Design a protein around this motif. Structure first.
Motif: not given
Ligand code: MG
Ligand code: MG
Ligand code: MG
Ligand code: MG
Ligand code: MG
Ligand code: MG
Ligand code: MG
Ligand code: MG
Ligand code: MG
Ligand code: MG
Ligand code: MG
Ligand code: MG
Ligand code: MG
Ligand code: MG
Ligand code: MG
Ligand code: MG
Ligand code: MG
Ligand code: ZN
Lengths: 69, 55
Positions: A5-9
RNA sequence: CGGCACCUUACGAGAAAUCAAAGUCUUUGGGUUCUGGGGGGAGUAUGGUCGCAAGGCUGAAACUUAAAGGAAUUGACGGAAGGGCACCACCAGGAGUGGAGCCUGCGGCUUAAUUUGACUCAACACGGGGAAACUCACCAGGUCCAGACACAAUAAGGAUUGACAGAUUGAGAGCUCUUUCUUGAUUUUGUGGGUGGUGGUGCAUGGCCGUUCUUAGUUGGUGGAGUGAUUUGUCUGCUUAAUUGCGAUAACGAACGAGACCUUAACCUACUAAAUAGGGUUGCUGGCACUUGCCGGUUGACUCUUCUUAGAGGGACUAUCGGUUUCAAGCCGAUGGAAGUUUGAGGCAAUAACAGGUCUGUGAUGCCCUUAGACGUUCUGGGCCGCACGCGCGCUACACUGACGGAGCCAGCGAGUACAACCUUGGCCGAGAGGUCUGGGUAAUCUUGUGAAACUCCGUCGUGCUGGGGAUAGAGCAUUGUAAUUAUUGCUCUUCAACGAGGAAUUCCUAGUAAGCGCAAGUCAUCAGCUUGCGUUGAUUACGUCCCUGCCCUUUGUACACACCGC
């Protein structure tokens, strides 16, 4: 398969901010000792209180104080 | 008797069947159920007079 | 004497089909003409020549290519021909399904995600797959290391371990950023190195399973036929469920498969046995008629083994008789007999296989991927259950052979807890569901005679989408669990929809079967329309055939052999 998915935090385990020969305790004379803050009532002496703005605890009993000092 | 054998390339499946001889089986029957061995007959001499043999 | 014509052995031949010539050929020579020299390019180009032409005779190379052919052998196959077999084929019939509603599978669509495997029989109530979380693999989100071991950077002036308080946080997840206390060399920061993965690939494998096929098929030792692959044995016929036998026979005797075998289902007044199975006499004792007799209740006594169980045995071998059949294998009918369909039913079940399924049973596993914000784990909330709609198992009904009430009232398989919470009678509460107290049972003892249904009897509605039918619905009462809305299930009232026996099609079936009927365990905390079993009620019609379907052989043909999805 389905893509990730890759949100980031990201969150890592804190390194702790290690510190030794801590500025607690003192000696003035030489012969005798002068304890700073205070020792634990529940457990024996040697363990020392955590000091905050009208809030205390100790680590050997994970964290179990309430009264001020 | 089945037994898998692990090797570098993969697995080898070993199976083994041993048909024990009936005579040396002891427990259960000592022979196959279909086999019917007939005993050899015994010879006799007919007639030779009526005769007797007393005591 | 002459031309248009069979059989055996060939010693003569021949690659073999075959051949009395295609013989007298490596034991090579009777006399002659003509033709051929891997396949294609090509009977083409060109020239000649011959022709009215169409074409003929004549006749290349370049270049290309590892086979092209022949003959047969085994297969496979064929809209070839004969002969078999099977209610997964059909007849003669039954029950049906397909229609109706509803369950449930599977598509399709939908959806963050509605996890995946499998699609003719041999996918589709299958994964023991009835998912409330777990399961679980999917999605949204968070947590955790469970990073074995090797080698260095910090090596206590802390490696890293912990951490109440509220904001933080879905959130009494220290998940953290607020914090300033603990923890003591486990670790930890790297680098070799493992480990886990319901990640991948079943067309990389094991094992198991399914399917060809529970069909009747399979094999080798001699011996014969062939140079040989091979073949015969293993077969014209008739039998049989069966390559089962009888027979005929370059085949003889054999093995596997079938059969035998095993388990179970049936018989035993013949044995061995029992207050954990059932009866008889008798004691006490309840009621009757009231004579002696009838039903009982009590583990009070004594004795029995028929039913019970279950040990050991027998018993059926198609037995006796009749026909029928080369008077064989057998089959057909009567008699007896518990049993005369292989006595019924299964369990196992050959050779060779399939790119059938399963790497989501597996610390069965190759290799690849992944491998510390994991595709590992683990929490939390969902999802597998969504709906314009297709098919597939299923249930419920379309009522009068019924419905509803009463009443009668009979089974067999089972299963069932002490470290848990099992079955749970018996007593009271509750219209129910269900609560409660109490037991009995680790079980032929108690649940349990599981007094299961369908059935049988007397009454109420009478052939009207009606009291048939019960769907969708609303509400409440219960229970299981942490959690029930996306009704878990039960019960109570209410709503009363479709459907007057279902077209083309197609399934299953031959006797205690079919169909009906319920029980039963399996899964299970809770859920049965499912399933493996069980018994109860219990028919109709064959007891044949190859018409269809499939399969099997035989003879045939084959440019096929990855084998008709072929070339
Ligand atoms: Mg993810
Ligand atoms: Mg040539
Ligand atoms: Mg089949
Ligand atoms: Mg389902
Ligand atoms: Mg089924
Ligand atoms: Mg459920
Ligand atoms: Mg695993
Ligand atoms: Mg794996
Ligand atoms: Mg496979
Ligand atoms: Mg496959
Ligand atoms: Mg031979
Ligand atoms: Mg043969
Ligand atoms: Mg006779
Ligand atoms: Mg049998
Ligand atoms: Mg009992
Ligand atoms: Mg009505
Ligand atoms: Mg089920
Ligand atoms: Zn303390």
């Amino acid at each position: 398969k389905k893509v990730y998915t890759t949100p980031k935090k990201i969150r890592h385990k804190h390194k702790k901010v290690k510190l030794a020969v801590l500025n607690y305790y003192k000696v003035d004379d030489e012969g005798k000792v002068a304890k700073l803050r205070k020792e634990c009532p529940n457990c024996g002496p040697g363990i020392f209180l955590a000091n905050h703005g009208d809030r205390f605890y100790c680590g050997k009993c994970h964290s179990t104080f309430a009264t001020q000092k | 008797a089945t037994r898998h054998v692990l090797l570098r390339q993969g697995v080898l499946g070993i199976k083994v069947k041993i048909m024990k001889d009936p005579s040396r089986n002891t427990s259960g029957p000592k022979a196959l159920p279909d086999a019917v061995t007939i005993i050899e007959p015994k010879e006799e001499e007919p007639v030779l007079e009526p005769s007797v043999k007393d005591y």
